[PDB]
């Protein structure tokens, strides 16, 4: 169960 | 179950 | 089950 | 169960 | 159970 | 003479990889 | 003469890898 | 003469790796 | 002559690794 | 007069090898 | 007078090999 | 002549590692 | 007069090898 | 006159090897 | 006249090897 | 001889083998 | 001889093997 | 001889093996 | 001889092995 | 001889082994 | 200059 | 200059 | 200059 | 200059 | 110059 994971790279 | 995962790269 | 995954690259 | 994890790298 | 973990690197 | 301009070798890949694996009985 | 400009070798990959593995009975 | 400009070798990868592993009975 | 500019070798990786491991009976 | 100039090499492999195998549901 | 100039090489392979194999449902 | 500029070798990795391990009966 | 110039090499492999295997559900 | 110039090498491997294997649910 | 110049090497491996294995649920 | 020039080589041979060797499924 | 030039080589051979060797499934 | 030049080499051979060797599943 | 030049080498061989060797699952 | 130059080497071989050796699960 | 993995799988 | 992993898997 | 892991897995 | 792990797993 | 772990696991 996954709810709202965020993976961001800049 | 996955709900709203986000993978962003810049 | 996948609901709203986002894969973005810039 | 995962709810709102955030992985950000700059 | 995970709720609001934050992983940030700059 | 025999000069060159401002050279640039830019390699910028933008890949989106997604593997979906499922075995159900 | 025989000069060069401001050279640049830029390699900027932007990869998005996602593996989904599931076995259910 | 025979000079060069301001050279730059920039390698900037931006990877997003995510592995999902599940076994359920 | 035979001079060079301000050189720069910049390696800046930005990786996001996430492993999800689950066994349920 | 010898200027060896600039030699810039960048190796960035993206090997994404995924595999699900060896699942015996008896 | 020798300027070796600029030599720029970039290798960025994108190998995405996926495989599901060896599933025996008896 | 035969001079160089202000050189810089900068290696700045930004990694985010997360391992999730779960066994439930 | 010998200037060896600038030689810049960057190796950044991205090996993402994932595998689920050897699951026996008897 | 010998200037060995600048030689800059950067190795930054990103090996992300994940594996779930050897799960026997009898 | 010998200047050995500047030689800069940076090794920063990112080995993230994860594994769940050997779970026997009898 | 007189071999003047920069040598900047990238060797990345890729060999991806996902196989079934000596497998007796059912 | 007279081999003048910078040698900047990147060797990254990739060998990814996900296999089944001598497996008796059911 | 006269081998003039900088040697800046990156060796990163990758060998990823996720296999089943002598496995009797059920 | 006359081997003039900086030697700046990065050796990072990667060997990742996640396997099943002699396993009798059920 | 005449081997002039700086030697700046980084050796970081990586060997990651997560395995099952002689395992009798159920 | 030789490029190629001598591989014998099997 | 030799590039390639001598690999014998199996 | 030799590049490659001599690997015998199995 | 030799690069590669002599590995015998198994 | 030799790079590589002589490893025999198993």
Author numbering:
A (entry chain K), B (entry chain P), C (entry chain U), D (entry chain F), E (entry chain A): 317 to 326
F (entry chain V), G (entry chain Q), H (entry chain L), I (entry chain G), L (entry chain B): 299 to 323
J (entry chain R), K (entry chain W), M (entry chain M), N (entry chain H), O (entry chain C), P (entry chain X), ...: 299 to 324
U (entry chain Y), V (entry chain T), W (entry chain O), X (entry chain J), Y (entry chain E): 300 to 309
Anything the authors wrote about it?
Nucleoporins rich in phenylalanine/glycine (FG) residues form the permeability barrier within the nuclear pore complex and are implicated in several pathological cellular processes, including oncogenic fusion condensates. The self-association of FG-repeat proteins and interactions between FG-repeats play a critical role in these activities by forming hydrogel-like structures. The human nucleoporin Nup98 plays an important role in multiple physiological and pathological processes. The N-terminal 384 residues of human Nup98 (named Nup98FG) comprise two prion-like domains connected by an approximately 50-residue-long linker.
To understand the mechanistic basis of the impact of the F319S mutation on the self-association and aggregation of Nup98FG, we aggregated a 30-residue peptide, which comprises residues 298-327 of Nup98FG, into amyloid fibrils. We subsequently optimized the helical parameters and obtained a map at 2.67 Å resolution. Each layer of the amyloid fibril of Nup98FG(298-327) is formed by five peptides in extended ß-structure-like conformation. Four of the molecules are oriented parallel and one, located at the edge, antiparallel. Side-chains are tightly packed without the presence of internal cavities. One is generated by the 300FSFG303 motif, which forms a four-phenylalanine patch (purple). The second one comprises the 317GLFG320 motif, which contains the mutated F319, and is flanked by two additional hydrophobic residues (methionine and valine). Together they form two zipper-like hydrophobic arrangements in the structure of the Nup98FG(298-327) fibrils (orange). In contrast, the tight zipper-like arrangement of the FG-repeats in the Nup98FG(298-327) fibrils facilitates hydrophobic patch formation with higher stability per residue. This may make it more difficult for nuclear transport receptors to open the FG-repeat meshwork in order to transport cargo across the NPC permeability barrier.
